[PDB]
Each structure stands twice: as C-alpha cells, then as structure tokens.
Design a protein around this ligand. Structure first.
Ligand SMILES: CC(=O)N[C@@H]1[C@@H](O)[C@H](O)[C@@H](COS(=O)(=O)O)O[C@H]1O
Length: 474
C-alpha cells in the first residue's frame, strides 16, 4: 500500500499559492507538487474554524453528521477516524504539529503525536512538545518574544532566530522521522500540520526580504459590506478585531507578512518532499496539501475566519497520487471538501468506505471517470464574533447562496461573473430563477434538522445557536 503524507496548514487562503494564479506569492515547492498531481480549484472547508474543519477532516463527515457546527471541541472518539482506519489497514501512524484535539494528547488511533498547539493549554499540566523543545534550545527565553497575539491583524518580523520558529520545528521533526523511516514493509501515515499561517503574522526577516519588490493584491471590498466601512485607526482598535477598515495599505502590509510565513512553510514542505525522494518513498506516496480554512485579511473589512466568503471557506487542495495509480496531472473544478480526504485514504489503503461516511473518494474525479459527484458543497458556521455571523451556504464555486439564520438575510454571489463576491445579486431580477433553485436546495439540505431549522417547507429564523448538534458523540 502507498505511504500517505497528509500535509496541512492552519488559516491559509485557497488563493495564497503561486499555482492558484497568485503572481506575488512565492510557493515553488507547492507549485511543483501541484504540477505533478491534481490541483482542486474549488476546495472548501464546510465549517471555517479550526475544530469543526478538523472534525470534518478526521471523520469524512459533514458538520451535521460529526455534530460540531462551529468553534468548539473535537469529540474524544468517533465511529470512523482517519489515523485508526489506517492503523487498522497496517499503517504506522504518527502526527507532527497542530492537532487541535480534545483532550490535546488524545490519539484517535495515532501511535504518537508531537504537538505544537500554539498558546492553548487545555489538558492538566499541558506543555506542547514544541514549547519543551524550545526551552532545550533557548532556556529562559520567551517563544512569544515577538509580542503579536494569536488572533491579531497586525504584523512584525520574528524577534527570535529562524531555527526556533514553530514552522522550522514542524518541518525539522517531520524530516527526521521520514529520514529515519526503515520499517520493513509497513507503509507510513505521517500527518504534518503547521500552526502558521494563522496569526501571529510573525515571519523571519529573511522571508519578509523575499517580498521587498512584491505588490501583494488589495483586499476586495463588496457593495454590501457598508456595516464595517468606517475607517478606524488600527493602533486604537482591539488588536484581535474580527471587523474593521484599517485602509488598503494596512491590509497589504499584514498580507505581505502573512505571505512570507507561507513561503517559510513552503520551504519546510520542500525539505519534507526532498527527504521522501531521497528515501525513495515519494513516487509510491499519496501526498495531500490542504488548509482547515482561509484568512479574510481585510476582504470586505473582515478579519479572521468563520464567514462564508471565499477568503474564509476556499482552501488550498492538492493531491500528488502514487505513480502506480496512473493519474494524469490536471485541474478539477468540482466542489470538493475536507470530508473527501478520509474516503480517498480508504480507497488508497484498499479498505471499503463505510456507508455512514459523507465524503466521496477523489481518485475517479482526478482520473476523469467519475459519474456521480455532488452538485453543491454545504458550508456553515455557528454564531461567532457577532450575533449576525450565523449562517449556512451552498456553492459549486460558480454560484454561492448564503442563509443568515439570526437576521433572515440571504446573499447570492455569481462566482463565475463576480469571483470577488462584490455584488449581492439576491434582488437582481436576472437571478430570480437561480435564487428560487438555491433556496429549494437549502430547504432540502436543512430539512433533516427538523422544525427549529425548516417548518412546513420554509426556512426558520433562529434566536438560539446550536454549536453541538444531536449527532455529536455522547
Ligand atoms: C474562531 C477563532 O477565532 N478562534 C481562535 C483560534 O483560531 C485561536 O487558535 C485561539 C487561540 O486561543 S489562545 O491560545 O487562548 O490565544 O483563539 C480562538 O479564538
């Protein structure tokens, strides 16, 4: 069976790779990986915050089926779990970096994890393996010396050496494990999960310098986003503001520091891919690159995540297939989601997909032999940051329909003609047929949830937030 190398980052935008048509972003290692595999052009996170997206990843299930509908705790045990499935298939299973699991040191079938959980301390007496390692390298030093908060919109260069940075530690420990892999006939399942480019925007100077002459794209500003248009002083606003117009210059400054941290990650991913080649493991590895969700980075005067817009839900999505499986490198436009990785792994490991998994293997689609694929992927997020930010959406990456549970507002974006989502087309006479169709799809989607979500074939305005659905493990 092929090695499975699941590489991922936290809070990386789908548009933030060179191979996604971004001219100012330096990702030569990811661009090369994508050149040798399938670049999914419409990869989505269904629930754009760390823990529900990671539950979707872990279980191959929709938010309604794994039961976490927004920013909460991943359940300690699910019926189907990515690492346990592969262990049960005879894989040696290990995870390095961010799991964001509950408890933090739960394994879900991994033989071990080596954790960077950033500043989160949840288990009694918890210190991340990264932070214990840091004290060995630099005893009495402060891994947060740079002084930028975990949720900040501001930026600064890393105030420690590059070799103490969590991105270096993550790539370095993954490189050593691959370098030392000599486990007879047992295939490796390695998860490599970067905390970055989630805030802080704290790139080393060396990586910021790679952007000295770069012009990074402006934030995109829709006609509908008036509610957050007032120009504010970033030095006076909350350092972790989820909303704010700090001007285009401020947004481009933070975006440059964001892009520098992606280029740092991309260099570590380069080391991991070279180690695999050096060990002769690359060509019979399934290699995945994804993120759990995007970063709005000033788009529509939004910061952070948990919104339906492209900057929040559109994710990087690359598969380099085993050379044996005979996939021609290409692009797939169909809407794919984090839930589709576990069933792909089942097929590649040669285990039958259970019927209670929502994702669908991606191998046929990549081979252009798929006869049944979803029309639309469902997206949602439970109330986060503000009472109004509570929603469910459907998209194929050509149209997106958004239902705001708390306000009863609808939005409709023609992604084909309006990829930046500048124009809410919900009151456009030209879009009445498409809108009628998408409202019917949202009712079909939400009906299983019962009378608090759909009553007598109508969408229900909710006054209460459901964070944990009835399908959340008991
Ligand atoms: C939805 C959202 O914005 N979630 C963020 C996470 O992305 C972040 O990882 C965490 C850090 O917590 S901390 O270690 O206490 O700073 O703070 C939460 O608010």
């Amino acid at each position: 069976q092929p090695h499975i190398i699941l590489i991922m980052t936290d809070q990386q935008r789908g548009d933030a790779m060179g191979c996604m048509g971004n001219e100012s972003l330096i990702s030569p290692h990811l661009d090369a990986l994508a050149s040798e595999g399938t670049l999914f052009m419409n990869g989505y996170s269904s629930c754009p915050s760390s823990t529900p997206a990671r539950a979707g990843l872990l279980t191959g299930q929709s938010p309604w089926h794994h039961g976490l509908l927004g920013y909460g705790k991943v359940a300690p045990k699910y019926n189907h779990e990515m690492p346990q499935m592969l262990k049960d298939a005879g894989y040696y299973t290990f995870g390095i970096g961010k799991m964001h699991w509950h408890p933090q040191r739960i394994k879900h079938g991994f033989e071990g994890t080596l954790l960077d959980e950033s500043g989160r301390r949840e288990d009694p007496n918890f210190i991340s393996d990264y932070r214990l390692w840091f004290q060995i390298q630099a005893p009495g030093k402060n891994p947060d010396e740079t002084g930028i908060g975990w949720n900040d919109h501001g930026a600064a260069t890393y105030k420690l050496k590059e070799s103490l940075h969590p991105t270096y530690w993550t790539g370095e420990m993954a490189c050593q494990m691959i370098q030392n892999y000599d486990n007879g006939n047992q295939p490796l399942f390695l998860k490599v999960s970067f905390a970055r480019p989630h805030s802080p925007y704290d790139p080393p100077q060396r990586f910021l310098d790679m952007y000295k002459d770069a012009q990074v794209p402006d934030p995109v500003i829709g006609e509908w986003c008036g509610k957050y248009a007032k120009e504010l002083d970033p030095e006076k606003a909350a350092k972790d503001a989820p909303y704010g117009n700090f001007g285009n210059e401020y947004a481009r400054h933070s975006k440059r520091y964001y892009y520098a941290n992606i280029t740092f990650i991309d260099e570590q991913i380069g080391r991991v891919l070279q180690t695999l080649k050096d060990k002769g493991m690359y060509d019979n590895s399934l290699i995945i690159f994804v993120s759990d969700h995007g970063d709005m980075m000033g788009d529509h005067y939004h910061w952070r995540k948990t919104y339906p817009y492209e900057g929040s839900t559109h994710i990087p999505y690359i598969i380099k297939w085993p050379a044996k499986a005979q996939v021609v490198p290409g692009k797939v436009d169909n809407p794919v989601e984090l839930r589709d990785l576990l069933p792909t792994f089942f097929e590649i490991a040669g285990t039958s997909v259970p019927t209670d998994i929502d994702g669908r293997s991606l191998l046929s689609l990549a081979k252009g032999t798929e006869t049944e694929w979803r029309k639309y992927i469902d997206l949602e997020h439970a109330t986060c940051y503000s009472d109004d930010n509570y929603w469910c959406a459907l998209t194929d990456g050509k149209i997106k329909y958004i239902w705001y549970f708390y306000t009863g507002e609808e939005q409709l974006f023609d992604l084909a003609k309006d990829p930046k989502e500048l124009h809410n087309a919900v009151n456009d006479k030209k879009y009445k047929k498409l809108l009628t169709g998408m409202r019917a799809e949202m009712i079909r989607h939400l009906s299983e949830r019962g009378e608090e979500f759909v009553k007598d074939g109508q969408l229900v305005v909710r006054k209460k937030t459901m964070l944990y659905g009835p399908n959340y493990p008991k």
